[PDB]
Every structure is written in structure tokens, then in C-alpha cells.
Swiss-Prot record, chain A:
Induction pattern: By ionizing radiation.
Role: Serine/threonine protein kinase which activates checkpoint signaling upon double strand breaks (DSBs), apoptosis and genotoxic stresses such as ionizing ultraviolet A light (UVA), thereby acting as a DNA damage sensor. Recognizes the substrate consensus sequence [ST]-Q. Phosphorylates 'Ser-139' of histone variant H2AX at double strand breaks (DSBs), thereby regulating DNA damage response mechanism.
Protein name: Serine-protein kinase ATM
Family: Belongs to the PI3/PI4-kinase family. ATM subfamily.
Effect of mutating N11T: In a colorectal adenocarcinoma sample; somatic mutation
Biological source species: Homo sapiens (Human)
């Protein structure tokens, strides 16, 4: 129901690739909210890393010393870009959570 | 020359000369391979010309359809036609402080004393000097400032083009390209187009607000025209889009007729709690709006008469008890 925020919902189709959507068939039976997810979406995807310790002074400024606590999205983006690619869903959701809601970014 | 005062989308508009090589010569300055990326508007214009020629000067001008035979990229037309479907043009109570509470502060200049400064010929030597100054270039700030003090439903009061009869041309040409081809991707292109039609909300006061609502109503009518095809393609996404449109319209009006027509639930009688928010938003602004909106909001009472599959409705209609205030007593 948000305005100008439905563009990030398209990233769910890329994040629902066959690399982690193996449990979708098991979750679509018991739950009921999967009816709208399967109609919107349904190969795999991967990425790489560059640095590991590139968040020395940027990790201690999640909430920000000054006002405008919305800068936490920059810390999440920095902790998601230069990190391990083990969490394929969290790595694919980095482009969506960049301009998404603050609650979703914190979660 | 207006580019300097105010450039990639101009190629699709300049390619209309072939309907020739001037557009390709102008595009060759930067990249001659970007013709496929900006081909969406060209294909939309070609489809519009074919629709105008199938059923006038357009029928004779559409004879240049052979220019599009350079490639055979037919799969790229899935996400296209968005601009063709969105185009429908080229086809108040702040004086309640009557008591002394407003006497301490200033008062509203609504009497004849507000216009008591007609005799101003003494300062004419300074008025004329300021008129010839750069103030004439900013004088529009005073004329573009009186567009306030009005929160009424102006949308409830507002023949745009002829795209309804020319909408099934591509479907009849490409074997139901709007319904069968759109259902191959599980209505993904349809959802993307529905999102892009609403993302273009920039000036809904008196500009694009009069055309975006009409485009949304036309898209809803085209999606609801199919009984089995739309229920086989997608229903939850359509319900979510309708609920989002209703929630966006309730934030302000005449578009409630489209929601009422989509809420008939002829083949969609398998609804769920996803309509509770819409039923609450329709009843919230029911008695607060005008008589026209109060009469058009009879969709809630029409849906309340459903005797089958209405267990969840009877369980979550606890919020409908507010209709007894301005009774609307029969619904309560």
C-alpha cells in the first residue's frame, strides 16, 4: 500500500530463484499467502566480494551521532556489499532494501 | 535548441518521419545500436496506426508498416504497449472561530474593506518602474498561488480519446496478445504496467490526475472483461492492485465506480479477508462525503447481501456498526 515503493517488490522475483525457492513448494501447501507470491514469480544467481575490513569507521555509525537516523541504510548497504556471499537472499535483497522502508532495512 | 534551455527518448519521437534516415543519422552520433532499446514507442505508434487503419488519413498513413521489418525481435513486445495503454490524449472550514477566540488575532479580510486600495495613482511612478523590471518574469507566482483553500472532491466532477475500440487490434493480430500472451508470464508484465501507471503520479491536481484515473479505469475494465481468462492468469495480484488503487483514492473520487464494478464478484466469489480493508475504507468516507458519493457507495450494501461464502464478512463486519450514526441504518 506504499507509494513509489512498489519498484523494490520486483526484486522479490529475482530473490525467489531456484537457489532458495526449494521450500516454496512445501510452504505453499500449509500457508495461504503463497497464492499471491507464486502468481507474481514462479536457474540461480550468485555474486562476489571485494573487501572485508572496509567498515572500520562506518560500522560504529549505524544510528548516527547527529540527527537523520535514516542513514542506517548506508551502513546496511556497506555491510551487505563487502561481506560474505553465503546468504544469497540477503545479498539479492541488498538492492531492494537500499531505498525500502526503515523497518524492512532494520529487519 | 530547447535541450540547452531545459536526450535519449527523442529518437523514438523522431523516428516517426519514416511513417526516415534522418533519425538514424542523428542517432549514429552517439550509438547506432540503441534503436532496439527505444523501439517501445515506435512499436506503440505502429500498433496505433494499424488499429486506426483496420477500422481517414490514418488508414493511408499507416502504409509504412514495412519499415519495422529490420529485425524479428517479437519476444521484446511483451513488456511493451505500456505507453500505448496509458495514452488517452493522442488517440474550507477555517472560519469556525466566530467567537472572541479569533478577535485577539487577525481576522479574515472578506468584507469590502479588503479591496479598499483602488485609488493608487500616487505610487504609479513606482509601480510602473517595477512593472518594467524583472518582476514581470515572476508575476506568475501570484497567479499560481490561488490554487488552494479547496479540499473538495474535484475528481468526482471530472470522451478523452478513442482507444477503447482500438484496444483489441493487437490481440486480434497476434492471437490475443493482450490476454493470452500476457498470461504466459503469469501477468508479470501486467503487474509491471499497473505499477508504472501509478508511479507516474506527479501532478494529480489538474494535470495528469484527469488522465491517470481514466487509464486505470480502462485497464481495470480490460482486465475484468475476461471471466475465465483473468481467473486463470492471475486473481490475487489483481485484487491487491485494486485494493492499492482504492487505498490511494481514499486518501483524497469518481473512480469508485470502477472498484464497485470490480467488486461484483461474479466469478471472484472466492474472496478473503483482503477485502476487509476496502470495506472499511468505503464505509469510513461514506457518510462524511457528499450525497453523490453516499449514493455511489451502495456497493458495500450490495456486497453485504451475499448469503453464501460470507462467514468472514459477517465476522469482520463489526466495523460496519458506525453506519448507525447518520442512518444508512438498514446496513447497520
Amino acid at each position: 500500500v506504499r507509494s513509489a515503493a512498489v519498484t523494490c517488490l520486483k526484486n522479490i522475483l529475482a530473490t525467489k530463484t531456484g537457489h532458495s525457492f526449494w521450500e516454496i513448494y512445501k510452504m505453499t501447501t500449509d500457508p495461504m499467502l503463497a497464492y499471491l507470491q507464486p502468481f507474481r514469480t514462479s536457474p540461480l544467481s550468485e555474486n562476489h566480494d571485494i573487501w572485508i575490513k572496509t567498515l572500520t569507521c562506518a560500522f560504529l555509525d549505524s544510528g548516527g551521532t547527529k540527527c537523520e537516523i535514516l542513514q542506517l541504510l548506508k551502513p546496511m548497504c556497506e555491510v551487505k556489499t563487502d561481506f560474505c556471499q553465503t546468504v544469497l537472499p540477503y545479498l539479492i535483497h541488498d538492492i531492494l532494501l537500499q531505498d525500502t522502508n526503515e523497518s524492512w532495512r532494520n529487519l | 535548441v530547447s535541450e540547452t534551455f531545459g536526450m535519449a527518448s527523442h529518437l523514438d519521437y523522431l523516428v516517426l518521419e519514416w511513417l526516415f534516415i534522418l533519425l538514424n543519422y542523428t542517432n549514429i552520433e552517439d550509438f547506432y545500436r540503441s534503436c532496439y532499446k527505444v523501439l517501445i514507442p515506435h512499436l506503440v505508434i505502429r500498433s496505433h496506426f494499424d488499429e486506426v487503419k483496420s477500422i481517414q488519413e490514418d488508414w493511408k498513413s499507416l502504409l509504412t508498416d514495412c519499415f519495422p521489418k529490420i529485425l524479428v525481435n517479437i519476444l521484446p513486445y511483451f513488456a511493451y504497449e505500456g505507453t500505448r495503454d496509458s495514452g488517452m490524449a493522442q488517440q474550507h472550514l477555517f472560519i469556525s472561530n466566530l467567537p472572541e477566540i479569533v478577535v485577539e488575532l487577525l481576522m479574515t479580510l472578506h468584507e469590502p474593506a479588503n479591496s479598499s486600495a483602488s485609488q493608487s495613482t500616487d505610487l504609479c511612478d513606482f509601480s510602473g518602474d517595477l512593472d518594467p523590471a524583472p518582476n514581470p518574469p515572476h508575476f506568475p507566482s501570484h497567479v499560481i498561488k490561488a490554487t488552494f483553500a479547496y479540499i473538495s472532491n474535484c475528481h468526482k466532477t471530472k470522451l478523452s480519446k478513442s482507444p477503447d475500440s482500438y484496444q483489441k487490434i493487437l490481440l486480434a493480430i497476434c492471437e490475443q496478445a493482450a490476454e493470452t500472451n500476457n498470461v504466459y508470464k503469469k501477468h508479470r508484465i501486467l503487474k509491471i504496467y499497473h505499477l508504472f501507471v501509478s508511479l507516474l503520479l506527479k501532478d494529480i491536481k489538474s494535470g495528469l490526475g484527469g488522465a491517470w484515473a481514466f487509464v486505470l479505469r480502462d485497464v481495470i475494465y480490460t482486465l475484468i472483461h475476461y471471466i475465465n481468462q483473468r481467473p486463470s492468469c492471475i486473481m490475487d495480484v489483481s485484487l491487491r492492485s485494486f485494493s492499492l488503487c482504492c487505498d490511494l483514492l481514499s486518501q483524497v473520487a469518481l473512480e469508485n465506480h470502477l472498484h464497485v464494478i470490480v467488486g461484483t464478484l461474479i466469478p471472484l466469489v472466492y474472496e478473503q479477508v483482503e477485502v476487509q480493508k476496502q470495506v472499511l475504507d468505503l464505509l469510513k468516507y461514506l457518510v462524511i462525503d457528499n450525497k453523490d458519493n453516499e449514493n455511489l457507495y451502495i456497493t458495500i450494501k450490495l456486497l453485504d447481501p451475499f448469503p453464501d461464502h460470507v462467514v468472514f464478512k459477517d465476522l469482520r463486519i463489526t466495523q460496519q456498526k458506525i453506519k448507525y450514526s447518520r442512518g444508512l441504518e438498514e446496513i447497520n
